[PDB]
Design a binder for these strands. Structure first.
Ligand SMILES: [Mg+2]
Ligand SMILES: [Mg+2]
Ligand SMILES: [Mg+2]
Ligand SMILES: [Mg+2]
Ligand SMILES: [Mg+2]
Ligand SMILES: [Mg+2]
Ligand SMILES: [Mg+2]
Ligand SMILES: [Mg+2]
Ligand SMILES: [Mg+2]
Ligand SMILES: [Mg+2]
Ligand SMILES: [Mg+2]
Ligand SMILES: [Mg+2]
Ligand SMILES: [Mg+2]
Ligand SMILES: [Mg+2]
Ligand SMILES: [Mg+2]
Ligand SMILES: [Mg+2]
Ligand SMILES: [Mg+2]
Ligand SMILES: [Mg+2]
Ligand SMILES: [Mg+2]
Ligand SMILES: [Mg+2]
Ligand SMILES: [Mg+2]
Ligand SMILES: [Mg+2]
Ligand SMILES: [Mg+2]
Ligand SMILES: [Mg+2]
Ligand SMILES: [Mg+2]
Ligand SMILES: [Mg+2]
Ligand SMILES: [Mg+2]
Ligand SMILES: [Mg+2]
Ligand SMILES: [Mg+2]
Ligand SMILES: [Mg+2]
Ligand SMILES: [Mg+2]
Ligand SMILES: [Mg+2]
Ligand SMILES: [Mg+2]
Ligand SMILES: [Mg+2]
Ligand SMILES: [Mg+2]
Ligand SMILES: [Mg+2]
Lengths: 262, 231, 69, 264, 94
RNA sequence: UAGUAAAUUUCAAUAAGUUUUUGAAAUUGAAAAAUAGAGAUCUACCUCUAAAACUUGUAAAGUUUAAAUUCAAUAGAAAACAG
RNA sequence: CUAAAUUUGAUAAUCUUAUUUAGUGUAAGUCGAUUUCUAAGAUAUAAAAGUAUAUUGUUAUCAAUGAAUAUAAAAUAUAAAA
RNA sequence: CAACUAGACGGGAAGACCCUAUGCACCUUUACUGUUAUCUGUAAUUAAUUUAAUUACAUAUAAAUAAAAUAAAUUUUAAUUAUUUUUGUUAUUGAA
């Protein structure tokens, strides 16, 4: 879960920085794993609809309990695995009934740690006195806390903070009407209910922000192809195309203005 | 001919329109029909007029039809078994070898039943104490709340009575599963299913610490009146 | 033979009619090849099937090949 | 019979009006001048048209008029079912005249009601009168079809969310799920207020209490079932050869636990 | 050789030997020339082919999920050929 | 043949590029032969008519035959066995 | 492959993967396919929707370039292996 | 005959550049006319009451919370709470 500063034995390893993907601690399974068709920015009729997208050597799917309401036993963590699209880690979880699943892990966890889901107040977890990375109801939480994968009361799935190093800070708590006012990563505010649910602690890989690819072939092997300027392009192909590289206004090929107030 | 109806490939037989008599002819050919075709033949007799006055245990081909099933019962798929049960249930049929091989064909498949297909077992085996042992019934009660919450309303109250008259009902089932539904999910059942409720709660030595007679049921009846008839 | 036929039909067709005992029956299919008329218009010939009937008994080579010439 | 829409259903029987494959042969065809929607619904002879828009300089271009549509569900007192219906604003203007919907289908002439779907409903509504022992389980095109999931996600259903072992897959795992108040029983509401109060006064928490005695037994049994899997873990790290990579990670994982300790 | 070219496109597939070894599906049950046209008819051709393979006389026994094949002698046609010993008639009349 | 006749804005076809009429889309919706509508915008007078259905078999390409009008092998047909 | 002949084989030709005429020849309870399974995909298509006839196609049939298999046969349920 | 290429304004494309034609194509723009995306008031779908909100009708998802159809279980699958939708579609006005 740490950065690697490489010694400049090549041009591309001079600035590169990447995370230890922890292959020794990834016991791979065939229970949660599918590999679907790679969608290269196309529809079913073959036509490109979103550009700059292609082959992905790291295509997979791993089914996850974003919602951990269905069991309350205590658990451990046997192993780990990595996700690419959000650059987040996960970890298996073995419940005391020998059950199994994957979960979103929080920052500060690792093999050997414990985790559970909580129906009742905090004093009634005699196991698992530490509380990080646990599925909990927002009312049954401290004054100060931060949530990372939120499931609203009027909803099945989670729609906020699912990316790396994110959270949802609390601004207020209104237990009267059971209505919380949480902050998003941007800064906007949203009404949520304390009957809703979420995880505790920021999601894994806080340190993706301190990354440098250093090689074009690290994106090509994800499904990120080569972009092209609208200025090298011919006037047929793009509304900037031509010999002049200056342009009032600054536009998009389907026709609309990108830069506003500008 | 232009404008043909674009019909599928499968050569199966739709009895759903046939007269009752036209079904019996095709049941003569029981050794060859497929098991999914028998299910659609027998269940529909129940839907045809004049099935009560008859005792199908004595009818020739219906009798042989069973004796073909009892051999080839464990070969059948788990869905099929729930389709036969109802058909022999609805036809008032008594055949000891039949109700052995169903039960051993259901202990296998009890884990692949839809909730709706778990109910038709829970009624058939508790509507008659002779069709099985009690050990098998005790398993069903130990499996009910898996499927309870998801079943139809008309399918619960039939599963709520068959507990009480037989006496398998506990405090566990009543306070955890049943009473919560009637106390929260109250008129969703409808009027024809709440009548039966109010004849059972008094028999149960029940307390009414709850305030749901007034607040949950009686205050919430007039939100349904379209269902009400003279009866 | 006519190439529509099959072995188990050929088997009982012989044992019932000619009444000869057999151990094994084989089969091979050929396609009629294309040729040219005198006026040089093409025409395809007929497709035919061969049968190598194995027997228990002995056979004289008058039926097995053509005479020594 | 001068209506082409009547000739088609004309020779049907009380037994052939049920074959859905055959009716769809008749409703999914094309009539000379009428649209393909106007037979799916009950427009009162109305169709769209074309023409020529104009300008200041009198140039001209094709323009499309279109017909009002009012998607709606209606109940037929005879058949005792709901039916979807697309219709104009002339039908609404007329249904109030003739009175109810089952009189529009049943008194109009097909020349004015230029639908097929309006005559399919007509003949299902006369047989029911000529024989109330007429079982109509499903009306055709009555309602659309709703799937469970999209076509994209048909694959992800294959693999299981939590894998239960063989002994446990089919039991009552019902008290184990996380319990909101509206879902949970009477005794547990009362126990919750007890649990809700002693959170504020943990001096009063002792093993000399029913609830605490009830819980501490349960939770310590769960921990004891994990120590084998714990010991299997700590051996892996022990026999793992590189320790710098381990000491490196513990420097990171501590940075998370420190934040969680001192939140602000 | 001469004049064989356009005559041979027209035949197309007149035999099972032509295409790769994994092309002909359920060969003997239907004649090729009726099968190869229907596959040009698109959709209903497939459906029509499937209905004939279902209802084909020349299937002398059902298939199996494995490479082995099941042989039922009752689907085989039968011949009423009697014995001809002590048979006085002969194929020409005096 | 009452959600009809007719009306307002637009378009279409009516010889008319404009001012009717006949019909359509949207919106409104009548009376009872004592009534109603057309008659190149509106008014009056008068005249005419009564806003339901049905009805004219052989059309068409292809083959063959008989006849008229034509070519006679670089013509006639793309082809005197050629799609 | 065999026999016979010489007509545009970049010469000649008694020769033939120039050309012409004819005849012979590929033996399967197992191998290789067919068959079963499924991927990308196709589709006057079930149900149902959209809509001007301006279109779709969660089914079904078809479709390896993939996975497994010969001796008793078919099927449901479970687990493991290839 | 072998060899060479000085000339036959040498041979090969009704050639290259240039001009005309009330010829063409493709591209550009604060060229002319215009179409569409898109913005907008009224009206219909659309109802009641109160002083613009509230309710009513209606659509759908979720909360351990009915389904149905496509061969295989016969009676509006209408409770509550929260949220979503008509920021719609059609005729029309003017702008673009
Ligand atoms: Mg494109
Ligand atoms: Mg991009
Ligand atoms: Mg670029
Ligand atoms: Mg350039
Ligand atoms: Mg362009
Ligand atoms: Mg441009
Ligand atoms: Mg420059
Ligand atoms: Mg062979
Ligand atoms: Mg259809
Ligand atoms: Mg619509
Ligand atoms: Mg080959
Ligand atoms: Mg084989
Ligand atoms: Mg005009
Ligand atoms: Mg004109
Ligand atoms: Mg007018
Ligand atoms: Mg008019
Ligand atoms: Mg008039
Ligand atoms: Mg006038
Ligand atoms: Mg005048
Ligand atoms: Mg007429
Ligand atoms: Mg001559
Ligand atoms: Mg000549
Ligand atoms: Mg000629
Ligand atoms: Mg030789
Ligand atoms: Mg030569
Ligand atoms: Mg010689
Ligand atoms: Mg040669
Ligand atoms: Mg050779
Ligand atoms: Mg295949
Ligand atoms: Mg293959
Ligand atoms: Mg020279
Ligand atoms: Mg020159
Ligand atoms: Mg000039
Ligand atoms: Mg059914
Ligand atoms: Mg609007
Ligand atoms: Mg508009």
């Amino acid at each position: 879960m740490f950065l690697k500063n490489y010694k400049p034995k090549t041009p591309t390893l001079r600035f590169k920085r990447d995370i230890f993907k922890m292959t020794p601690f990834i016991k791979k399974n065939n229970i949660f794993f599918i590999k679907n068709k790679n969608k290269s920015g196309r529809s079913t009729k073959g036509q490109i609809i979103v550009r700059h997208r292609g082959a992905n050597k790291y295509n997979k799917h791993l089914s996850i309990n974003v919602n951990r309401n269905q069991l309350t036993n205590l658990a451990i963590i046997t192993s780990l695995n990595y996700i690419n699209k959000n650059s987040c880690f996960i970890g298996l979880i073995k419940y005391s009934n020998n059950c199994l699943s994957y979960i979103k892990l929080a920052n500060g966890l690792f093999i050997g740690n414990y985790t559970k889901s909580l129906d009742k107040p905090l004093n009634f977890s005699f196991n698992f006195r530490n509380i990080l990375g646990s599925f909990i109801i927002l009312n049954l939480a401290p004054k100060h806390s931060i949530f990372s994968n939120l499931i609203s009361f009027n909803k099945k799935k989670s729609n906020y903070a699912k990316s790396a190093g994110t959270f949802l800070s609390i601004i207020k708590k209104i237990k009267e009407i059971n209505l919380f006012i949480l902050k998003l990563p941007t800064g906007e505010k949203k009404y949520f209910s304390g009957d809703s649910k979420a995880t505790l602690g920021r999601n894994s890989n806080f340190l993706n922000k301190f990354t440098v690819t250093g090689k074009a072939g690290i994106n090509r092997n994800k499904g990120w192809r080569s972009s092209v300027r609208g200025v090298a392009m011919n006037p047929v192909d793009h509304p900037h195309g031509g010999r002049t590289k200056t342009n009032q206004p600054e536009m998009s090929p389907w026709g609309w203005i990108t830069k506003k107030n500008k | 001919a232009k404008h043909t109806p674009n019909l599928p490939t499968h050569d199966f037989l739709n009895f759903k329109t046939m007269t009752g008599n036209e079904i019996l002819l095709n049941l003569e050919n029981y050794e060859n029909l497929r098991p999914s075709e028998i299910c659609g033949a027998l269940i529909e007799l129940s839907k045809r007029e004049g099935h009560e006055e008859i005792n199908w245990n004595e009818h020739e081909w219906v009798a042989a039809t069973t004796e073909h099933v009892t051999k080839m019962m464990p070969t059948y798929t788990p869905s099929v078994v729930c389709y036969l049960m109802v058909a022999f249930q609805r036809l008032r049929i008594t055949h000891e070898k039949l109700w052995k091989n169903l039960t051993f064909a259901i202990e296998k498949t009890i884990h692949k039943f839809n909730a709706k297909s778990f109910a038709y077992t829970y009624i058939a085996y508790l509507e008659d104490t002779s069709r099985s042992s009690e050990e098998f019934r005790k398993k069903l009660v130990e499996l009910l709340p898996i499927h309870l919450h998801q079943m139809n309303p008309n399918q619960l109250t039939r599963c709520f009575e068959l507990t009480f008259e037989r006496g398998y009902m506990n405090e566990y089932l009543f306070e955890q599963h049943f009473h919560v539904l009637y106390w929260r999910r109250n008129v969703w059942f409808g009027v024809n299913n709440i009548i039966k409720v109010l004849e059972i709660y008094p028999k149960l030595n029940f307390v009414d610490d709850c305030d749901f007679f007034e607040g949950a049921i009686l205050a919430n009846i007039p939100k349904v009146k379209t269902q009400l008839n003279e009866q | 033979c006519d190439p529509k036929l099959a072995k188990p039909e050929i088997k009982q067709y012989l044992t019932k009619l000619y009444g000869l005992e057999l151990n094994k029956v084989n089969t091979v299919r050929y396609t009629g090849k294309l040729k040219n008329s005198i006026l040089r218009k093409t025409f395809k010939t007929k497709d035919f099937k061969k049968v190598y009937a194995v027997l228990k008994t002995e056979v004289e080579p008058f039926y097995q090949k053509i005479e020594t010439m | 019979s001068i209506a082409k829409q009547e000739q088609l259903f004309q020779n049907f029987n009380q037994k052939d009006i049920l074959n859905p494959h055959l009716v769809n042969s008749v409703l999914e065809r094309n009539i000379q001048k009428r649209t393909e929607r106007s037979q799916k619904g009950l427009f009162h002879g109305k169709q769209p048209k074309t023409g020529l828009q104009t300008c200041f300089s009198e140039k001209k271009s094709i323009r499309w008029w279109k017909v009002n549509v009012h998607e709606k569900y209606l109940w037929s007192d005879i058949l005792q079912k709901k039916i979807r219906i697309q219709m104009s604003s002339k039908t609404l203007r007329t249904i109030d005249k003739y009175g109810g919907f089952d009189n529009y289908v049943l008194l109009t002439k097909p020349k004015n009601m230029d639908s097929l779907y309006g005559e399919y409903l007509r003949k299902l509504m006369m047989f029911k009168l000529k024989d109330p022992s007429f079982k109509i389980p499903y009306i055709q095109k009555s309602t659309p079809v709703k799937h469970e999931v999209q076509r994209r996600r048909k694959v992800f259903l294959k693999r299981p969310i939590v894998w239960y072992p063989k002994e446990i897959r089919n039991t009552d795992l019902t008290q184990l799920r996380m319990k909101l108040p509206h879902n949970m029983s009477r005794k547990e509401l009362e126990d919750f207020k007890v649990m809700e109060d002693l959170n504020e006064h943990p001096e009063r928490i002792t093993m000399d209490h029913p609830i605490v005695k009830r819980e501490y037994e349960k939770q310590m049994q769960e921990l004891k079932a994990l120590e084998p899997e714990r010991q299997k873990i700590m051996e892996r790290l022990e026999r793992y050869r590189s320790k710098k990579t381990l000491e490196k990670i513990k420097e990171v994982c501590k940075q998370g636990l420190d934040e969680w300790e001192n939140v602000q | 050789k001469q004049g064989q070219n356009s005559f041979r496109k027209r035949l197309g597939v007149y035999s099972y030997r032509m295409k790769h070894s994994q092309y002909h599906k359920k060969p003997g049950l239907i004649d090729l020339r009726t099968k190869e046209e229907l596959k040009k008819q698109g959709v209903q051709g497939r459906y029509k082919i499937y209905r004939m393979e279902r209802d084909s006389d020349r299937l002398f026994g059902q298939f199996s999920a494995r490479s082995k094949f099941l042989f039922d002698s009752q689907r085989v046609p039968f011949l009423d050929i009697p014995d001809l010993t002590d048979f006085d008639l002969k194929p020409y009349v005096s």
